[PDB]
Amino acid sequence: FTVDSARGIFPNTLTADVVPATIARFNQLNAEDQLALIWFAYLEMGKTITVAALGAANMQFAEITMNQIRQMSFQEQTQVMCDLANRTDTPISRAYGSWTANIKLGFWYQLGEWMAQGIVAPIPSGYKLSANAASVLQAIQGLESGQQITVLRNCVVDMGFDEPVVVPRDMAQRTQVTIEGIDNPTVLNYMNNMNANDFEVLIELFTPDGALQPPFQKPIVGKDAVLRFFREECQNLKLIPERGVTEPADGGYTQIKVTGKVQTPWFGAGVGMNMAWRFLLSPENKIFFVAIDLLASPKELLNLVR
Amino acid sequence: MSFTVDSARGIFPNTLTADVVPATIARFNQLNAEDQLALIWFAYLEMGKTITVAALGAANMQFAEITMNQIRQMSFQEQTQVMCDLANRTDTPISRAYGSWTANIKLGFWYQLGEWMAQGIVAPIPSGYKLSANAASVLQAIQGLESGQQITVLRNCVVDMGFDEPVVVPRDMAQRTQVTIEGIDNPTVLNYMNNMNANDFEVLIELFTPDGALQPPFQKPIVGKDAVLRFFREECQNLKLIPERGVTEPADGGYTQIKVTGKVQTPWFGAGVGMNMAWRFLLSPENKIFFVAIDLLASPKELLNLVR
Numbered sequence: 001f002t003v004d005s006a007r008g009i010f011p012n013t014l015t016a017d018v019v020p021a022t023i024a025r026f027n028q029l030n031a032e033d034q035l036a037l038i039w040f041a042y043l044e045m046g047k048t049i050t051v052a053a054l055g056a057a058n059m060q061f062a063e064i065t066m067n068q069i070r071q072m073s074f075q076e077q078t079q080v081m082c083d084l085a086n087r088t089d090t091p092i093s094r095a096y097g098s099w100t101a102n103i104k105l106g107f108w109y110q111l112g113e114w115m116a117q118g119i120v121a122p123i124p125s126g127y128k129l130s131a132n133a134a135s136v137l138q139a140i141q142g143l144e145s146g147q148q149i150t151v152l153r154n155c156v157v158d159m160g161f162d163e164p165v166v167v168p169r170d171m172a173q174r175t176q177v178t179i180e181g182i183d184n185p186t187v188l189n190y191m192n193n194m195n196a197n198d199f200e201v202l203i204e205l206f207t208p209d210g211a212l213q214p215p216f217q218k219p220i221v222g223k224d225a226v227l228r229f230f231r232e233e234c235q236n237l238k239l240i241p242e243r244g245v246t247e248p249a250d251g252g253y254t255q256i257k258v259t260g261k262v263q264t265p266w267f268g269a270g271v272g273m274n275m276a277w278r279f280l281l282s283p284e285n286k287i288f289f290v291a292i293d294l295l296a297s298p299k300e301l302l303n304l305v306r
Numbered sequence: 307m308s309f310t311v312d313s314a315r316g317i318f319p320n321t322l323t324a325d326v327v328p329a330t331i332a333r334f335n336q337l338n339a340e341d342q343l344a345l346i347w348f349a350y351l352e353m354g355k356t357i358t359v360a361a362l363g364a365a366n367m368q369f370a371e372i373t374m375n376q377i378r379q380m381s382f383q384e385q386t387q388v389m390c391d392l393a394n395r396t397d398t399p400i401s402r403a404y405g406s407w408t409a410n411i412k413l414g415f416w417y418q419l420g421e422w423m424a425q426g427i428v429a430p431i432p433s434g435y436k437l438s439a440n441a442a443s444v445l446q447a448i449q450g451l452e453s454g455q456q457i458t459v460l461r462n463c464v465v466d467m468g469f470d471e472p473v474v475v476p477r478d479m480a481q482r483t484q485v486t487i488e489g490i491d492n493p494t495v496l497n498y499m500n501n502m503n504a505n506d507f508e509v510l511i512e513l514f515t516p517d518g519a520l521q522p523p524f525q526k527p528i529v530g531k532d533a534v535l536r537f538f539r540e541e542c543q544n545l546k547l548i549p550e551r552g553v554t555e556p557a558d559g560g561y562t563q564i565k566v567t568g569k570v571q572t573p574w575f576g577a578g579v580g581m582n583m584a585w586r587f588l589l590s591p592e593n594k595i596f597f598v599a600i601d602l603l604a605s606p607k608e609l610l611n612l613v614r
């Protein structure tokens with residue numbers, strides 16, 4: 001096996017490719033339509049946000065920028081927001097591009113609160129989305145909540161351009177998952193370490209050259225890059241695996257598929273995303289490859305075909 | 307100034323473009339390399355459209371001759387790996403060579419490989435290959451698109467693989483034709499269309515302001531005469547522009563906004579495929595192009611969408 005050959009295990013897992021499709025549609029819209037579309041989608045999303053994600057040492061990184069924006073006029077604020085959407089090369093857009101996803105999300109959450117408070121320039125009254133933007137908004141509002149929030153997140157994170165430590169949860173307070181059909185400690189402890197933010201232990205489950213493929217992204221290859229990804233993107237998730245299957249693969253490898261739900265700290269139990277994990281484990285029972293997929297619909301939770 | 311390039315992008319915002327094309331490309335980009343190759347094989351086979359002899363013998367293929375002949379001599383296993391390296395945008399000598407090529411060389415390369423696949427010279431899509439669930443759905447989506455949208459999906463997928471010519475002679479004035487656009491007599495728009503059809507890019511570039519920009523379908527504004535002229539020379543050769551209808555309206559500061567709808571034919575398919583397009587011009591008071599966007603329209607209905 002190579003990483004690229006591992007990518008196709010369990011090939012009839014149907015993923016929610018409407019998400020990258022919809023993001024690509026959003027990417028065609030001009031900056032003002034993008035900002036207005038997100039405003040409308042966000043307001044109409046009946047899902048309340050918790051800002052336990054993006055903590056203090058993290059959000060300290062965007063404080064300077066947020067203080068700059070808070071001192072500009074409504075016209076300068078609008079230009080900055082458009083520079084972000086346009087991925088323009090400006091000092092603030094470069095600052096934004098340096099941040100992790102949760103810092104970017106917390107930044108926009110604060111601007112959104114200030115917009116409802118009149119502290120930051122609002123979407124102009126009586127604004128009309130372009131014909132294409134109106135159709136993108138309608139498509140988003142037809143998606144399952146888990147897909148809606150992934151579209152919004154990825155659009156936010158793609159904006160801009162030109163990590164404090166995470167201490168794991170105390171052992172006594174930790175939960176342990178139960179996965180129907182799966183007894184393998186490498187899979188069980190992948191989930192338990194994730195749920196405890198115990199990334200320095202989790203990385204030891206991988207082969208030295210092992211790879212992790214997040215939803216709609218390319219494989220991240222090797223312990224150094226995977227550990228960096230854990231530390232930067234994976235804090236405070238709740239993984240709720242339900243059921244899985246295991247089967248032998250070529251050369252003494254083992255392939256395992258698990259389905260279940262994931263909650264993000266931004267929405268807690270209010271949004272459950274339907275996920276699959278597809279593992280290829282080495283003969284020594286280490287993770288050579290794991291893919292994490294956002295599933296097309298709840299019907300895919302029952303698709304456990306070997 | 308009354309406009310910036312980014313503020314010009316939104317002119318005629320009721321124009322409904324075929325964003326199903328970038329959406330479907332994004333779905334295709336989720337598939338692994340072998341699935342991508344098989345999907346394009348079946349999509350290319352299901353299309354009933356023929357590539358022209360004039361594009362088939364394109365002299366620029368000499369840049370790719372050595373690489374193709376190398377591939378032809380490889381084993382089927384090596385050939386498959388090369389093709390996957392291309393789909394994966396891997397850093398290899400062959401993928402770097404492909405990434406150095408122009409779009410037209412890239413298309414001719416894959417046309418030749420596909421011919422060789424049918425002739426038993428290059429490794430075929432394996433006989434017992436089953437598309438993934440996602441890939442089968444993407445293939446079904448492509449089959450439901452208008453041919454002009456199908457070929458745009460296929461072209462963009464080809465051009466995006468890999469990584470890690472002489473300019474056409476303008477046609478003699480005596481041999482040129484003149485477009486006719488119902489509703490539009492603006493000479494800058496007519497001159498844009500006629501110079502494009504004549505491959506007279508050095509005259510065409512003089513129609514733009516120095517800070518002026520051109521926005522190709524599903525791409526970002528290309529800003530400045532140097533960048534735009536390089537784009538004309540590299541990409542826009544031997545097209546046939548068939549504008550039919552248009553509307554002109556005043557814009558701020560004495561500018562003029564013009565929308566034209568019509569059809570475009572690529573030299574790859576000749577008259578076999580007519581893509582429904584809009585051109586959206588923002589002209590300075592001095593009659594120069596400050597911004598022009600070229601859109602692939604969502605459906606033929608949009609040819610009649612000529613409201614402000």
Ligand SMILES: CC1=C(/C=C/C(C)=C/C=C/C(C)=C/C=C/C=C(C)/C=C/C=C(C)/C=C/C2=C(C)C(=O)CCC2(C)C)C(C)(C)CCC1=O
Pocket residue numbers: 034035036038039042049105108109111112115149150152153156194213214215233234237239262264266273275277292
């Ligand atoms: C932008 C903007 C606004 C603001 C808008 C705002 C504030 C928008 C905020 C939107 C928010 C807070 C979106 C958060 C989405 C989080 C997701 C999808 C996390 C998924 C994680 C997953 C699947 C993890 C999976 C994982 C598992 C299971 C593993 O096993 C391995 C790890 C891995 C990570 C792969 C305004 C409202 C101001 C209007 C203007 C404007 O433009």
Ligand SMILES: CC1=C(/C=C/C(C)=C/C=C/C(C)=C/C=C/C=C(C)/C=C/C=C(C)/C=C/C2=C(C)C(=O)CCC2(C)C)C(C)(C)CCC1=O
Pocket residue numbers: 342343344346347350357413416417419420421423457458460461464502521522523541542545547570572574581583600
């Ligand atoms: C890859 C592959 C294969 C091969 C597949 C093959 C051979 C695929 C070949 C596909 C081909 C030949 C696609 C050609 C597409 C051309 C288009 C959309 C031109 C558009 C031009 C336009 C819109 C003009 C626009 C213009 C106007 C009007 C302006 O006014 C301004 C300029 C501008 C340019 C913007 C196999 C079958 C071997 C399988 C394996 C595999 O993977």
